[PDB]
Amino acid sequence: NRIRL
Amino acid sequence: SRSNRAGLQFPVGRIHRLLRKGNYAERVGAGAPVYLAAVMEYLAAEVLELAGNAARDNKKTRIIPRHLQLAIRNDEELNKLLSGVTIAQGGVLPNIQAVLLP
Amino acid sequence: SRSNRAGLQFPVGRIHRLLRKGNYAERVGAGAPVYLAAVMEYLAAEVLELAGNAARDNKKTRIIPRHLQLAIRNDEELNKLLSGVTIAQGGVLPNIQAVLLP
Amino acid sequence: DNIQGITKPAIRRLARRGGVKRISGLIYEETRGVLKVFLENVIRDAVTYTEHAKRKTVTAMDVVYALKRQGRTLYGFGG
Amino acid sequence: DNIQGITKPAIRRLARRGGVKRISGLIYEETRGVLKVFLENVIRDAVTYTEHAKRKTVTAMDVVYALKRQGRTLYGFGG
Amino acid sequence: VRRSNRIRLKPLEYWRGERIDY
Amino acid sequence: RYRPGTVALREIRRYQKSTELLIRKLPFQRLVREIAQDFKTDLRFQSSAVMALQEASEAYLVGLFEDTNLCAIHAKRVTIMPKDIQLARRIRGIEGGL
Amino acid sequence: RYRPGTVALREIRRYQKSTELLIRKLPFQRLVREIAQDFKTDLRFQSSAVMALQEASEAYLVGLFEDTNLCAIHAKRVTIMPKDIQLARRIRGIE
Amino acid sequence: ESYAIYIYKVLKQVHPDTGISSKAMSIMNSFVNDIFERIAAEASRLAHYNKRSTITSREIQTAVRLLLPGELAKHAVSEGTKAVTKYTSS
Amino acid sequence: ESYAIYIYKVLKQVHPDTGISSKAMSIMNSFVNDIFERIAAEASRLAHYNKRSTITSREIQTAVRLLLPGELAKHAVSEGTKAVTKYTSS
DNA sequence: ATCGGATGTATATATCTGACACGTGCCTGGAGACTAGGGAGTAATCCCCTTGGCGGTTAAAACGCGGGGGACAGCGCGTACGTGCGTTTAAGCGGTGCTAGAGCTGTCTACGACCAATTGAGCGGCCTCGGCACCGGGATTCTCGA
DNA sequence: TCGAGAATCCCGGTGCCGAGGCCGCTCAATTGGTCGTAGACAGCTCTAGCACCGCTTAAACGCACGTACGCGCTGTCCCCCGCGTTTTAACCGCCAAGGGGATTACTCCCTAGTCTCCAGGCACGTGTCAGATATATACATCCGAT
């Protein structure tokens, strides 16, 4: 659920 | 079992002996191998999940080294961790400099 | 004594204890602490000698951090060894680029 | 405000020891950046060691353990 | 003689993966240099591990132990 | 009554310069 | 009958996309033999052991070319010269090529 | 009545020869205090602990300026610009 | 004597449909080992600093905060904390 | 609890005339420690590779050849070999 | 290219401070002497796999000839950084004072090492198959000379 | 902006072998005990880090000035790219030897573990001389003039 696309 | 009581896939029992025979301390705690097993499994899951979704868009159902490379080198937090290590036959991310284009 | 029987200055007895309590292995050899004591003493001698020679050129009889810095950074093998380490208040070797001179 | 505690001639002489001749204007601001970044990384690990030791006072050895834990090993303050 | 075993287009395409456009002529010889230098350092450490194991045959793990002992950690051949 | 010596050089560079062999 | 530099771009993206070894296996095979001969004579290499050398070698070289190219562009030129490679290693430090 | 750049060289050799800290003691002390506030509140620093920060920081910067200058000269110029600082860090790698 | 069978179990949880090649399996196996020793050494080195002869969950947790960058360290700690608390009852 | 008194003995050997400041003494003391753990860890890691539970003179020697760069490793081995052989008969 | 004027810098000397060096008393860590376990040296084994030969296929390395284009030297415009001097800001020194908290010590409780008997998770070996490499052929996309 | 030409993407068929699921078979993990001590814990000692007052002045700030350096642009050219042809030899599949990794079976001997004993090495005083400090001065460098 972190930074992603 | 212990790993089943830990709700983890990674063997807490095997990890526990490794902190003993690995010569890290005289007395290794009881919760220590459980905690470490939860961190290892998480990171393993974190890579596999990012690799697999990156593998399915490539229309392949088997994860190959290129997929792992694409997963790690495209995540800020992950890439920094595995900065010094190079994945065998993983290739490199397609990057072309700006001033090299017409 | 043992270090005196070894013909060394560095305490073979103390080093033997550190290799034991330091958790590097279960069984530490008998010759192992002696061998390591001779290597440490040698490198210490190698550095100190170059430091003193760098101290005699500064007209000083007391070795200061500056002397140590000058010694290490002028020897290939020493500088390569202590590459990652930085000497506190040792300064830097006087180096001016060619194209910066009149 | 306090990051400006370090001054322009302070950075200017740091570059002299580095052996440079002419220094641009934007350098001084860029240098403040890498300095605050460097301090952040070291102190973060340093405080982390301090907190693990159940102490409210950071010590020299804590900074050494932090610096040495990222290729910036330092001699003179313990080992 | 054997260092010339690797070829010009071999080096040429290695630089393509590196993302370069135009490659000079003296590059190919310079590249052979750093390759022979890199291999020497790795093999020296690798053979050193092999000799300590009282063996005349270098194994994959020996190369891994050598590579990992100088910031060049390698995944894929054991761990 | 003193101490011995070895073969010392200099920074000796690299990236273009020589490496030592025997 | 294209243009000087067009094919250059074509080979870049086709190799970055691939993971295949860019150097021949057998010439590299005997290359490791010679270098190891100086340290110890009559040595044997596992089939995977040589691959380990080849993977790390190519990986290092590709990484080096990237830093080299960055130095080249910084010098307002698009062609890499030994002048760039040498500087790239110096800035990398000791651990970074020695 | 000297020349633009002559005194610059004189200051180079005068600082390389010395081992004195090039940054002020007191501003750097409270600077470390501020940075530490984000990680933990109400912290105390040993007299040697702050000095340890100043030594490593200054040493790193000087080392960084050296690599920077080489990039500057590589662009056939003698003046260092932020373009050089950024590139110097990229080539150095991580940590 | 590896983690081969465990990484496959974790894979099927996050992705029951996809599989993994043997070469990539070795890579992931080298990964969890390189993660293991990296944390273990740091935890051992941490206890040595405090003159403690025991590695515990507290050492492992602090080691995570030192190694893992930032956004990863937080979740890693939580995943670790939850596990220990599971082993307090059952 | 340091090597302060021993480095001074070695100092008088290479240079009986000159002395050393407390700051430089601390540097040299941090040096021999950084040399100790670096070799000890490598030697420990070396025996672990060969599944041996004993660190011996043979492991330490191999560690020297791995850490110490050329020409320094050779003399270091000789200095070590000379020491061991003296404590073998006496 | 030569010269004196002007600025900074290395050099000789003298005084003055404080930190290094040596001293002693004390204690606890290392040397002696002894026993016993078991890791390791040692010999003999099995057989894995590394090395080396012939020989055909052909992908790829080598060679050469244009010629577009980028490396390179020159050079003209001009902003901007260096140099210097005067005004201004706080660092530095030291002095005094409180108290948070590093450091230490003596409790005794909880915890991991330890051993042994047990057994199921996990490694090694074995087919089985369908994902993927291989391929050929047509749809699509990017490049390039008037 | 226009179309011709060459590459890459893509759609579907066929064939190959590696990955995935089964199966004995250990042997390492688990259970359930007990023993000993590392460490959680509370009280105490006091180092030292913090904070304000106030004098000195080294150092930072701001400003005016001139030059040489950054940078843009035009010129030259030679060298590296692109292409077609010839040449090399990597690649692959096969067969064959035996060096030596991996293995195992015994048994020696080297090291951990202890108690006692005492001296090596720590803390901590005590005095002095190397060196920080200052100043007057000879010597080394830059710079404008010619």
Side-chain angles (χ1 to χ4, degrees), chain A residues 2-4, chain B, chain C residues 1-40 42-102, chain D residues 1-55 57-79, chain E, chain F, chain G, chain H residues 1-32 34-95, chain I, chain J:
Chain A
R2 305 176 290 99
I3 58 103
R4 259 141 177 178
Chain B
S1 178
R2 192 190 303 181
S3 61
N4 286 121
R5 294 182 181 180
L8 297 174
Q9 301 308 133
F10 284 4
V12 184
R14 298 222 298 102
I15 273 58
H16 188 41
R17 83 171 175 87
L18 287 184
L19 280 61
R20 288 175 174 179
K21 312 300 291 184
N23 277 263
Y24 300 96
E26 313 285 336
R27 309 175 63 183
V28 292
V34 199
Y35 197 103
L36 183 57
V39 178
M40 293 172 60
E41 184 172 333
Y42 166 71
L43 297 173
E46 188 75 14
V47 174
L48 284 174
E49 170 68 18
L50 196 53
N53 57 50
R56 72 151 304 275
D57 54 47
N58 196 18
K59 310 301 178 297
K60 254 172 179 176
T61 196
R62 294 186 192 171
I63 295 181
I64 40 84
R66 172 60 175 182
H67 296 157
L68 292 176
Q69 174 78 0
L70 292 171
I72 304 165
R73 307 307 175 185
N74 282 279
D75 199 334
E76 302 175 8
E77 300 321 299
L78 205 59
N79 174 71
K80 184 180 302 177
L81 189 179
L82 295 184
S83 181
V85 65
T86 59
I87 288 90
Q89 204 180 348
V92 300
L93 273 49
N95 60 94
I96 296 89
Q97 289 300 298
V99 80
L100 298 185
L101 294 175
Chain C
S1 178
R2 192 190 303 181
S3 61
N4 286 121
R5 191 191 295 105
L8 296 173
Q9 301 308 300
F10 284 5
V12 183
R14 171 186 295 186
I15 283 181
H16 188 205
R17 173 201 67 183
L18 287 184
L19 282 173
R20 288 174 62 180
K21 310 180 65 62
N23 277 263
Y24 300 97
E26 41 276 293
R27 310 173 62 96
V28 181
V34 200
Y35 198 103
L36 182 56
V39 178
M40 293 172 60
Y42 166 71
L43 297 172
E46 189 75 14
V47 173
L48 284 174
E49 171 180 358
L50 295 172
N53 295 16
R56 186 168 297 103
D57 305 328
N58 282 136
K59 314 303 178 188
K60 258 62 190 64
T61 327
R62 295 187 193 287
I63 295 180
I64 49 175
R66 173 60 175 182
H67 297 157
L68 292 175
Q69 174 78 0
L70 293 171
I72 303 301
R73 307 307 175 185
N74 283 279
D75 199 334
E76 205 208 340
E77 302 322 299
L78 282 183
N79 175 71
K80 184 181 302 177
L81 187 67
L82 297 184
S83 62
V85 194
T86 59
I87 289 90
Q89 59 185 354
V92 73
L93 182 72
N95 178 82
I96 295 88
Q97 289 300 298
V99 80
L100 297 185
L101 294 175
Chain D
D1 52 323
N2 206 327
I3 185 61
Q4 299 295 333
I6 59 100
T7 68
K8 168 174 180 178
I11 302 179
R12 190 177 177 90
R13 69 179 63 102
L14 278 175
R16 297 307 178 183
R17 180 170 290 183
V20 315
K21 189 174 174 183
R22 222 161 73 103
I23 309 173
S24 175
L26 296 82
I27 291 290
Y28 306 99
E29 287 299 323
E30 190 70 24
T31 308
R32 293 186 175 85
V34 304
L35 175 59
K36 192 171 187 172
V37 167
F38 180 82
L39 286 176
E40 274 190 17
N41 292 263
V42 178
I43 293 170
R44 177 189 300 108
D45 296 331
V47 174
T48 308
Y49 279 113
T50 310
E51 182 69 15
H52 184 87
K54 303 175 181 176
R55 296 187 276 97
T57 301
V58 184
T59 168
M61 296 305 297
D62 285 16
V63 182
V64 171
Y65 302 152
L67 283 168
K68 189 182 303 189
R69 206 196 59 85
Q70 51 186 39
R72 309 260 66 256
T73 312
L74 181 64
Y75 288 161
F77 303 92
Chain E
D1 53 323
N2 206 327
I3 185 61
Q4 299 295 333
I6 58 100
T7 68
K8 168 174 180 178
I11 302 179
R12 191 177 177 90
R13 69 179 63 102
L14 278 174
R16 297 307 178 183
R17 179 170 289 183
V20 315
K21 188 175 174 184
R22 222 162 73 102
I23 309 173
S24 175
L26 296 178
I27 289 290
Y28 307 99
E29 287 299 323
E30 191 70 24
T31 308
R32 293 185 175 85
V34 305
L35 175 59
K36 192 172 187 173
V37 166
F38 180 82
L39 286 176
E40 274 191 17
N41 292 263
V42 178
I43 293 170
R44 177 189 300 107
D45 297 330
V47 174
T48 308
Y49 279 113
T50 310
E51 182 69 15
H52 184 87
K54 303 175 182 176
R55 296 187 277 97
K56 304 187 63 180
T57 301
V58 184
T59 167
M61 296 305 297
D62 285 16
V63 182
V64 171
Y65 302 152
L67 283 169
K68 189 183 303 189
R69 206 196 59 85
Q70 51 187 39
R72 309 260 66 256
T73 313
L74 181 64
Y75 289 161
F77 303 93
Chain F
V1 208
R2 297 169 181 175
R3 291 296 305 263
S4 168
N5 279 243
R6 61 177 240 277
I7 306 183
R8 333 162 184 277
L9 296 95
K10 250 190 64 175
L12 180 136
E13 295 176 350
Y14 56 98
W15 71 81
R16 62 181 293 273
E18 169 192 14
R19 67 180 301 178
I20 51 185
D21 266 272
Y22 96 103
Chain G
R1 310 199 307 182
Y2 290 111
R3 295 275 294 280
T6 305
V7 182
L9 269 301
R10 189 169 322 162
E11 46 186 333
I12 292 182
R13 50 180 59 99
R14 76 145 291 186
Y15 279 124
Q16 294 181 327
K17 183 179 178 181
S18 61
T19 64
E20 63 224 354
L21 296 185
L22 298 185
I23 62 183
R24 318 299 292 281
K25 178 180 176 299
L26 189 55
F28 187 87
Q29 175 80 202
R30 54 174 70 97
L31 178 58
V32 182
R33 307 287 186 181
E34 162 179 324
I35 302 189
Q37 191 71 15
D38 298 318
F39 306 99
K40 187 182 181 61
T41 59
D42 195 88
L43 284 180
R44 287 168 192 271
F45 296 149
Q46 290 193 356
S47 306
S48 57
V50 179
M51 296 302 293
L53 265 310
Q54 192 164 354
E55 290 287 349
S57 300
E58 297 182 12
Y60 171 78
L61 287 174
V62 169
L64 183 56
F65 275 116
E66 297 179 348
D67 294 337
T68 296
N69 190 52
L70 284 179
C71 271
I73 302 180
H74 185 278
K76 302 183 180 182
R77 68 176 78 100
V78 306
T79 307
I80 51 173
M81 295 149 58
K83 181 193 305 177
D84 308 284
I85 300 191
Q86 296 169 353
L87 178 63
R89 303 181 61 189
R90 206 187 169 180
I91 306 176
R92 274 180 161 192
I94 302 296
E95 300 300 328
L98 171 131
Chain H
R1 309 197 151 175
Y2 292 110
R3 296 275 293 280
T6 305
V7 182
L9 270 67
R10 189 166 53 195
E11 303 161 351
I12 293 181
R13 51 182 61 259
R14 179 183 170 271
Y15 280 122
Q16 295 181 327
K17 182 179 68 273
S18 60
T19 64
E20 176 194 353
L21 296 185
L22 298 185
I23 321 180
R24 320 299 291 109
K25 309 296 155 62
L26 189 55
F28 187 87
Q29 175 174 352
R30 54 175 152 92
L31 178 58
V32 180
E34 162 179 324
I35 304 303
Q37 289 283 357
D38 298 318
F39 307 100
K40 186 73 175 183
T41 179
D42 196 332
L43 283 180
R44 284 169 191 86
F45 297 91
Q46 290 243 352
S47 306
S48 57
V50 49
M51 296 302 293
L53 265 310
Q54 191 165 0
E55 290 287 350
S57 59
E58 172 172 342
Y60 171 79
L61 287 174
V62 170
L64 183 56
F65 275 116
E66 297 179 348
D67 294 338
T68 295
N69 190 237
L70 281 36
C71 271
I73 302 180
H74 186 27
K76 302 183 300 179
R77 65 177 149 86
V78 306
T79 307
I80 50 173
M81 295 150 58
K83 303 194 309 176
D84 308 283
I85 300 283
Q86 296 169 353
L87 178 63
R89 303 182 60 189
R90 291 195 181 101
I91 307 176
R92 274 180 160 192
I94 32 77
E95 299 181 357
Chain I
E1 296 81 4
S2 66
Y3 300 89
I5 67 175
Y6 309 104
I7 307 162
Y8 200 88
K9 294 179 183 178
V10 179
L11 174 63
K12 289 306 181 183
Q13 290 187 5
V14 303
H15 276 351
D17 50 285
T18 53
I20 181 176
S21 64
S22 297
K23 312 156 185 189
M25 173 53 66
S26 181
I27 300 181
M28 292 285 319
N29 195 94
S30 301
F31 172 76
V32 296
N33 277 120
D34 187 32
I35 294 301
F36 167 66
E37 294 181 353
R38 205 183 174 174
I39 300 184
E42 183 60 39
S44 178
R45 174 168 55 256
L46 183 52
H48 194 279
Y49 288 159
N50 302 278
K51 302 302 179 183
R52 291 183 180 177
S53 302
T54 58
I55 266 60
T56 62
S57 314
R58 192 187 183 265
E59 277 75 10
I60 308 300
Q61 172 167 148
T62 311
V64 167
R65 288 188 171 105
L66 286 175
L67 269 51
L68 283 309
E71 199 74 299
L72 256 185
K74 300 184 68 178
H75 295 66
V77 165
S78 70
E79 281 287 345
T81 305
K82 293 177 69 177
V84 174
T85 54
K86 290 174 77 286
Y87 185 69
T88 51
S89 62
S90 303
Chain J
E1 296 81 4
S2 67
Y3 299 89
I5 68 175
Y6 309 104
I7 307 162
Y8 200 88
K9 293 179 183 178
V10 180
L11 174 63
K12 289 306 181 183
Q13 289 187 5
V14 304
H15 276 351
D17 50 285
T18 53
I20 181 176
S21 64
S22 60
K23 313 156 186 301
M25 173 53 66
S26 181
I27 298 182
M28 292 284 319
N29 196 93
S30 301
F31 172 76
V32 296
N33 277 120
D34 186 32
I35 296 301
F36 167 66
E37 294 181 353
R38 204 183 295 184
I39 300 184
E42 184 60 39
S44 177
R45 174 167 54 256
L46 182 51
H48 194 279
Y49 288 158
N50 302 278
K51 302 303 179 182
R52 291 183 180 177
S53 302
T54 58
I55 266 60
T56 62
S57 314
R58 192 188 183 265
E59 276 75 10
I60 307 300
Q61 172 166 148
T62 310
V64 167
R65 288 188 171 105
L66 286 175
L67 269 51
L68 283 309
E71 199 72 15
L72 255 186
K74 300 184 68 178
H75 294 66
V77 166
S78 70
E79 281 287 345
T81 305
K82 182 188 300 179
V84 173
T85 54
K86 288 173 76 285
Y87 184 69
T88 312
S89 62
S90 182

